[model samples]
Target: MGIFPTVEKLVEEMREQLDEVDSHPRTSIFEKLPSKRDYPDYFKVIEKPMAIDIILKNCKNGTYKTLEEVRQALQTMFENARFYNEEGSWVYVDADKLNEFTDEWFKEHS
Candidate 1:
Protein backbone atom coordinates (compact mmCIF):
# COMPACT_ATOMS: atom_id res chain seq x y z
CA MET A 1 0.00 0.00 0.00
CA GLY A 2 1.10 3.54 -0.68
CA ILE A 3 2.17 5.63 2.29
CA PHE A 4 -0.57 8.01 1.21
CA PRO A 5 -3.00 7.74 -1.67
CA THR A 6 -3.41 11.49 -1.86
CA VAL A 7 -2.02 14.76 -0.56
CA GLU A 8 -4.82 15.02 1.98
CA LYS A 9 -3.96 11.56 3.19
CA LEU A 10 -0.31 12.59 3.46
CA VAL A 11 -1.26 15.59 5.56
CA GLU A 12 -3.31 13.41 7.87
CA GLU A 13 -0.52 10.88 8.22
CA MET A 14 2.00 13.62 8.99
CA ARG A 15 -0.29 15.15 11.60
CA GLU A 16 -0.72 11.76 13.24
CA GLN A 17 3.02 11.32 13.33
CA LEU A 18 3.44 14.75 14.82
CA ASP A 19 0.88 14.06 17.52
CA GLU A 20 2.50 10.75 18.37
CA VAL A 21 6.03 12.17 18.55
CA ASP A 22 5.19 15.55 20.03
CA SER A 23 5.13 14.26 23.62
CA HIS A 24 8.69 12.98 23.33
CA PRO A 25 11.82 15.05 23.81
CA ARG A 26 12.81 16.81 20.60
CA THR A 27 15.45 19.23 19.43
CA SER A 28 14.64 22.54 17.86
CA ILE A 29 15.31 22.90 14.12
CA PHE A 30 17.23 26.08 14.85
CA GLU A 31 19.14 24.82 17.87
CA LYS A 32 22.53 25.09 16.19
CA LEU A 33 21.78 28.16 14.13
CA PRO A 34 21.75 31.84 15.02
CA SER A 35 18.33 33.30 15.64
CA LYS A 36 16.92 35.76 13.11
CA ARG A 37 17.04 38.47 15.81
CA ASP A 38 20.71 37.75 16.36
CA TYR A 39 21.37 39.54 13.10
CA PRO A 40 20.22 43.07 13.83
CA ASP A 41 20.62 43.99 10.19
CA TYR A 42 19.67 41.23 7.77
CA PHE A 43 19.66 40.96 4.02
CA LYS A 44 17.82 38.66 1.65
CA VAL A 45 20.89 36.58 1.00
CA ILE A 46 19.52 34.00 -1.43
CA GLU A 47 17.67 35.22 -4.50
CA LYS A 48 16.58 31.77 -5.68
CA PRO A 49 14.57 32.14 -8.85
CA MET A 50 14.76 28.36 -9.42
CA ALA A 51 12.85 27.72 -6.20
CA ILE A 52 10.01 29.88 -7.44
CA ASP A 53 10.09 28.15 -10.79
CA ILE A 54 9.87 24.74 -9.14
CA ILE A 55 6.91 25.78 -7.01
CA LEU A 56 5.14 27.24 -10.01
CA LYS A 57 5.64 24.02 -11.93
CA ASN A 58 4.38 21.88 -9.07
CA CYS A 59 1.38 24.12 -8.53
CA LYS A 60 0.51 24.03 -12.23
CA ASN A 61 0.77 20.24 -12.20
CA GLY A 62 -1.90 20.00 -9.44
CA THR A 63 0.52 19.26 -6.62
CA TYR A 64 -1.00 22.49 -5.34
CA LYS A 65 -4.08 24.52 -6.24
CA THR A 66 -2.52 27.87 -7.02
CA LEU A 67 0.60 29.84 -6.36
CA GLU A 68 -1.10 32.18 -3.92
CA GLU A 69 -2.74 29.34 -2.00
CA VAL A 70 0.50 27.43 -1.87
CA ARG A 71 2.30 30.50 -0.63
CA GLN A 72 -0.31 31.18 2.05
CA ALA A 73 -0.49 27.52 3.10
CA LEU A 74 3.26 27.36 3.47
CA GLN A 75 3.38 30.59 5.43
CA THR A 76 0.84 29.11 7.82
CA MET A 77 2.29 25.59 7.99
CA PHE A 78 6.01 26.09 8.50
CA GLU A 79 6.09 29.45 10.22
CA ASN A 80 2.82 29.60 12.15
CA ALA A 81 2.35 32.72 10.05
CA ARG A 82 0.04 34.16 7.45
CA PHE A 83 0.37 36.64 4.63
CA TYR A 84 -2.18 39.30 3.84
CA ASN A 85 -2.43 42.57 2.01
CA GLU A 86 -4.13 45.93 2.44
CA GLU A 87 -2.73 46.95 -0.91
CA GLY A 88 -0.08 45.55 -3.25
CA SER A 89 1.80 42.40 -2.27
CA TRP A 90 1.24 40.28 0.84
CA VAL A 91 2.99 40.73 4.16
CA TYR A 92 3.82 37.96 6.62
CA VAL A 93 3.46 38.39 10.32
CA ASP A 94 4.12 35.79 12.99
CA ALA A 95 1.40 36.58 15.53
CA ASP A 96 3.12 34.66 18.30
CA LYS A 97 6.37 36.58 17.82
CA LEU A 98 4.83 40.00 17.24
CA ASN A 99 4.84 40.84 20.95
CA GLU A 100 8.51 40.01 21.23
CA PHE A 101 9.65 43.09 19.35
CA THR A 102 6.92 45.35 20.66
CA ASP A 103 7.74 44.44 24.25
CA GLU A 104 11.42 45.03 23.73
CA TRP A 105 10.88 48.42 22.08
CA PHE A 106 8.44 49.65 24.71
CA LYS A 107 10.77 48.60 27.52
CA GLU A 108 13.60 50.63 25.97
CA HIS A 109 11.46 53.74 25.40
CA SER A 110 9.28 53.59 28.50
Candidate 2:
Protein backbone atom coordinates (compact mmCIF):
# COMPACT_ATOMS: atom_id res chain seq x y z
CA MET A 1 0.00 0.00 0.00
CA GLY A 2 1.83 3.04 1.28
CA ILE A 3 5.04 1.14 0.75
CA PHE A 4 4.31 0.94 -2.98
CA PRO A 5 2.93 4.16 -4.34
CA THR A 6 3.49 3.52 -8.02
CA VAL A 7 5.12 1.05 -10.34
CA GLU A 8 8.42 2.67 -9.48
CA LYS A 9 7.83 1.94 -5.83
CA LEU A 10 7.28 -1.73 -6.49
CA VAL A 11 10.44 -1.87 -8.55
CA GLU A 12 12.43 -0.29 -5.76
CA GLU A 13 10.94 -2.65 -3.20
CA MET A 14 11.36 -5.57 -5.55
CA ARG A 15 14.89 -4.48 -6.25
CA GLU A 16 15.61 -4.46 -2.55
CA GLN A 17 13.91 -7.81 -2.10
CA LEU A 18 14.98 -9.70 -5.25
CA ASP A 19 18.33 -10.43 -3.65
CA GLU A 20 19.98 -8.89 -0.70
CA VAL A 21 23.38 -9.30 0.88
CA ASP A 22 23.72 -12.84 2.18
CA SER A 23 20.22 -13.55 0.96
CA HIS A 24 18.83 -16.03 -1.53
CA PRO A 25 18.55 -14.52 -4.96
CA ARG A 26 15.29 -14.75 -6.80
CA THR A 27 14.07 -14.41 -10.34
CA SER A 28 12.53 -11.20 -11.58
CA ILE A 29 8.76 -10.86 -11.46
CA PHE A 30 8.78 -10.59 -15.22
CA GLU A 31 10.44 -13.98 -15.35
CA LYS A 32 8.31 -15.37 -12.53
CA LEU A 33 5.07 -14.84 -14.44
CA PRO A 34 3.48 -18.05 -15.66
CA SER A 35 2.70 -18.64 -19.31
CA LYS A 36 -0.75 -17.59 -20.49
CA ARG A 37 -1.95 -21.09 -21.34
CA ASP A 38 -0.78 -22.45 -18.02
CA TYR A 39 -3.08 -20.12 -16.05
CA PRO A 40 -5.53 -22.24 -14.00
CA ASP A 41 -8.42 -19.98 -12.90
CA TYR A 42 -10.39 -17.18 -14.58
CA PHE A 43 -11.56 -14.79 -11.86
CA LYS A 44 -9.76 -11.81 -13.43
CA VAL A 45 -12.87 -9.91 -14.36
CA ILE A 46 -11.23 -6.50 -14.76
CA GLU A 47 -12.21 -4.68 -17.95
CA LYS A 48 -9.86 -4.97 -20.91
CA PRO A 49 -9.60 -1.37 -22.13
CA MET A 50 -8.64 -0.02 -18.74
CA ALA A 51 -6.25 -2.86 -18.18
CA ILE A 52 -4.62 -2.23 -21.57
CA ASP A 53 -4.02 1.40 -20.75
CA ILE A 54 -2.40 0.46 -17.48
CA ILE A 55 -0.26 -2.18 -19.13
CA LEU A 56 0.98 0.01 -21.99
CA LYS A 57 1.65 2.90 -19.69
CA ASN A 58 3.53 0.81 -17.16
CA CYS A 59 5.24 -2.09 -18.93
CA LYS A 60 8.54 -1.75 -20.71
CA ASN A 61 9.07 -2.47 -24.39
CA GLY A 62 9.26 -6.15 -25.42
CA THR A 63 8.50 -7.25 -21.87
CA TYR A 64 4.77 -7.50 -22.43
CA LYS A 65 3.98 -6.89 -26.05
CA THR A 66 0.33 -7.90 -26.16
CA LEU A 67 -2.82 -7.43 -24.11
CA GLU A 68 -3.13 -11.18 -23.61
CA GLU A 69 0.27 -11.38 -21.99
CA VAL A 70 -0.44 -8.45 -19.71
CA ARG A 71 -3.81 -9.77 -18.64
CA GLN A 72 -2.57 -13.29 -18.00
CA ALA A 73 0.43 -12.10 -16.02
CA LEU A 74 -1.73 -9.97 -13.72
CA GLN A 75 -4.12 -12.86 -13.19
CA THR A 76 -1.28 -15.10 -12.18
CA MET A 77 0.11 -12.45 -9.90
CA PHE A 78 -3.26 -12.06 -8.17
CA GLU A 79 -3.71 -15.80 -7.86
CA ASN A 80 -0.38 -16.13 -6.13
CA ALA A 81 -1.26 -13.30 -3.77
CA ARG A 82 -4.37 -15.24 -2.72
CA PHE A 83 -7.30 -14.82 -5.06
CA TYR A 84 -10.54 -14.54 -3.09
CA ASN A 85 -13.83 -14.97 -4.86
CA GLU A 86 -16.62 -13.17 -3.07
CA GLU A 87 -20.35 -13.64 -3.44
CA GLY A 88 -20.10 -12.97 -7.17
CA SER A 89 -16.70 -11.40 -7.79
CA TRP A 90 -13.04 -11.70 -7.05
CA VAL A 91 -11.07 -9.72 -4.47
CA TYR A 92 -7.86 -9.77 -2.54
CA VAL A 93 -7.36 -9.88 1.17
CA ASP A 94 -5.32 -6.73 0.69
CA ALA A 95 -6.79 -4.56 -2.03
CA ASP A 96 -3.96 -2.08 -1.76
CA LYS A 97 -1.39 -4.77 -2.33
CA LEU A 98 -3.18 -5.71 -5.51
CA ASN A 99 -2.88 -2.17 -6.78
CA GLU A 100 0.74 -2.10 -5.80
CA PHE A 101 1.43 -5.38 -7.57
CA THR A 102 -0.51 -4.16 -10.57
CA ASP A 103 1.67 -1.09 -10.81
CA GLU A 104 4.80 -3.10 -10.34
CA TRP A 105 3.77 -5.84 -12.77
CA PHE A 106 2.82 -3.42 -15.53
CA LYS A 107 5.98 -1.42 -15.05
CA GLU A 108 8.19 -4.46 -15.28
CA HIS A 109 6.16 -6.06 -18.07
CA SER A 110 5.76 -2.90 -20.11
Candidate 3:
Protein backbone atom coordinates (compact mmCIF):
# COMPACT_ATOMS: atom_id res chain seq x y z
CA MET A 1 0.00 0.00 0.00
CA GLY A 2 1.06 3.61 0.40
CA ILE A 3 1.93 5.92 3.27
CA PHE A 4 -1.71 6.70 3.86
CA PRO A 5 -4.78 4.49 4.08
CA THR A 6 -6.23 3.41 0.77
CA VAL A 7 -9.70 4.54 -0.19
CA GLU A 8 -10.83 0.97 0.35
CA LYS A 9 -9.44 0.91 3.87
CA LEU A 10 -11.08 4.19 4.76
CA VAL A 11 -14.38 3.09 3.27
CA GLU A 12 -14.26 -0.21 5.14
CA GLU A 13 -13.85 1.62 8.41
CA MET A 14 -16.61 4.01 7.45
CA ARG A 15 -18.91 1.12 6.71
CA GLU A 16 -18.11 -0.48 10.04
CA GLN A 17 -18.72 2.79 11.82
CA LEU A 18 -22.12 3.07 10.18
CA ASP A 19 -23.18 -0.51 10.76
CA GLU A 20 -25.14 0.21 13.91
CA VAL A 21 -26.93 3.18 12.42
CA ASP A 22 -27.68 1.26 9.25
CA SER A 23 -29.20 -1.62 11.19
CA HIS A 24 -31.11 0.43 13.73
CA PRO A 25 -34.81 -0.32 13.52
CA ARG A 26 -35.58 3.37 13.34
CA THR A 27 -33.19 4.04 10.46
CA SER A 28 -32.93 0.64 8.80
CA ILE A 29 -35.03 1.70 5.82
CA PHE A 30 -31.87 3.33 4.54
CA GLU A 31 -30.03 0.03 4.40
CA LYS A 32 -31.20 -0.47 0.80
CA LEU A 33 -32.60 1.64 -2.00
CA PRO A 34 -36.11 2.82 -1.36
CA SER A 35 -38.62 1.03 -3.59
CA LYS A 36 -39.74 3.22 -6.46
CA ARG A 37 -43.13 1.56 -6.42
CA ASP A 38 -43.62 1.88 -2.68
CA TYR A 39 -42.53 5.50 -2.54
CA PRO A 40 -42.81 6.86 -6.04
CA ASP A 41 -42.44 10.42 -4.81
CA TYR A 42 -39.09 9.53 -3.27
CA PHE A 43 -37.57 9.09 -6.71
CA LYS A 44 -38.83 12.49 -7.71
CA VAL A 45 -37.87 14.26 -4.50
CA ILE A 46 -34.44 12.70 -4.25
CA GLU A 47 -32.69 13.59 -7.47
CA LYS A 48 -29.83 11.30 -6.56
CA PRO A 49 -31.22 8.53 -4.46
CA MET A 50 -28.69 6.99 -2.10
CA ALA A 51 -28.53 4.27 0.54
CA ILE A 52 -25.92 2.35 2.51
CA ASP A 53 -25.83 -0.54 0.06
CA ILE A 54 -25.41 1.77 -2.91
CA ILE A 55 -22.67 3.71 -1.11
CA LEU A 56 -20.81 0.49 -0.33
CA LYS A 57 -21.06 -0.67 -3.94
CA ASN A 58 -19.86 2.67 -5.24
CA CYS A 59 -16.92 2.63 -2.85
CA LYS A 60 -16.00 -0.97 -3.71
CA ASN A 61 -16.32 -0.42 -7.47
CA GLY A 62 -14.09 2.66 -7.42
CA THR A 63 -16.89 5.06 -8.25
CA TYR A 64 -15.76 6.95 -5.16
CA LYS A 65 -12.27 8.48 -5.35
CA THR A 66 -11.99 9.62 -1.75
CA LEU A 67 -13.48 9.41 1.72
CA GLU A 68 -14.85 12.91 1.33
CA GLU A 69 -16.93 11.67 -1.60
CA VAL A 70 -18.33 8.94 0.63
CA ARG A 71 -19.11 11.55 3.27
CA GLN A 72 -20.99 13.63 0.73
CA ALA A 73 -22.99 10.61 -0.36
CA LEU A 74 -24.02 9.94 3.21
CA GLN A 75 -24.81 13.59 3.81
CA THR A 76 -27.09 13.47 0.79
CA MET A 77 -28.81 10.36 2.07
CA PHE A 78 -29.58 12.07 5.38
CA GLU A 79 -30.76 15.18 3.61
CA ASN A 80 -33.14 13.04 1.57
CA ALA A 81 -34.45 11.43 4.75
CA ARG A 82 -34.98 14.76 6.46
CA PHE A 83 -36.66 16.21 3.41
CA TYR A 84 -39.04 13.34 2.84
CA ASN A 85 -40.21 12.94 6.42
CA GLU A 86 -41.88 15.63 8.47
CA GLU A 87 -39.80 17.21 11.22
CA GLY A 88 -41.58 15.49 14.08
CA SER A 89 -41.87 12.12 12.39
CA TRP A 90 -40.01 9.22 13.92
CA VAL A 91 -38.14 8.64 10.72
CA TYR A 92 -36.96 12.19 10.64
CA VAL A 93 -35.84 11.99 14.25
CA ASP A 94 -33.82 8.87 13.66
CA ALA A 95 -32.39 10.24 10.44
CA ASP A 96 -31.29 13.31 12.34
CA LYS A 97 -29.63 11.13 14.95
CA LEU A 98 -27.81 9.09 12.34
CA ASN A 99 -26.75 12.19 10.50
CA GLU A 100 -25.27 13.54 13.68
CA PHE A 101 -23.37 10.31 14.09
CA THR A 102 -21.94 10.69 10.60
CA ASP A 103 -20.95 14.28 11.21
CA GLU A 104 -19.15 13.27 14.38
CA TRP A 105 -17.45 10.37 12.64
CA PHE A 106 -15.98 12.63 9.98
CA LYS A 107 -14.88 15.16 12.58
CA GLU A 108 -13.10 12.53 14.66
CA HIS A 109 -11.57 10.72 11.70
CA SER A 110 -10.61 13.74 9.70
Q: List clash counts for every candidate, in order.
A: 0, 2, 0
**Candidates ranked, most accurate by lDDT first:** 3, 2, 1
Worst 10 residues of 1 by lDDT: 24-33
By the TM-score metric, which is better: model 1 or model 3?
3
| lDDT (10s digit) by residue, model 2, range 1-110 | 22114433544544444333344322233323334466534325422212323444446545655545655755655554443334222233333344465566666754
Superposed Cα deviation of residue 47, candidate 2 (Å): 27
lDDT of 1 by residue, 57-105 (tens): 4554766663345444333332322222122212122222322332343
Supply the TM-score for candidate 2.
0.27
Best by lDDT: 3
Per-model TM-score, in order, reads: 0.22, 0.27, 0.75
lDDT of candidates 1 onward, in order:
0.31, 0.42, 0.71
By TM-score, the best candidate is 3
lDDT per residue for candidate 3 within 13-98, as digits (tens), equals 44453334346454466778877899798799889888877777776677876778888988898889899889977678777877
